[PDB]
Structure 1
């Protein structure tokens, strides 16, 4: 019958399992591709 010591286990128990493991790699690849776009910026002459 605890209303706070047990809460800390709840977060661990409920950390977050739902496509977060495989899904995290998919978003990471999108960020590297945006970096290549800067090369076209040379045409801007800035």
Structure 2
């Protein structure tokens, strides 16, 4: 008997690996929103 669930350990890892990519790159675009909003509020201020 057996069952090599070793290709899982690996394969799942890539899964996390890509979500860090999506997870990071995603944020990169929320900063543009962010800062562009501080500035927008600086100008309308004075």
With structure 1 as the length reference, what TM-score do the two structures score?
A: 0.40
Question: Residues 44 and 3 (structure 1 numbering): CA distance in 2 closer, same or farther, change over 3 Å?
Answer: farther
Q: Which runs of 5+ in 2 are unaligned?
A: none
**Counterpart-to-counterpart distance in 2, 1:16 and 1:25:** 14
C-alpha displacement of 1:15 = 13
Q: Is 2:25 the counterpart of 1:22?
A: no
Stretches (4+) displaced over 2 A: 1-18, 38-46
Question: Residues 4 and 36 (structure 1 numbering): CA distance in 2 closer, same or farther, change over 3 Å?
Answer: same
When the two structures are aligned, how many residues end up with a matched partner? 46
Query: What residue in structure 1 maps to residue 3 of structure 2?
Result: 3
C-alpha displacement of 1:22 = 2.1
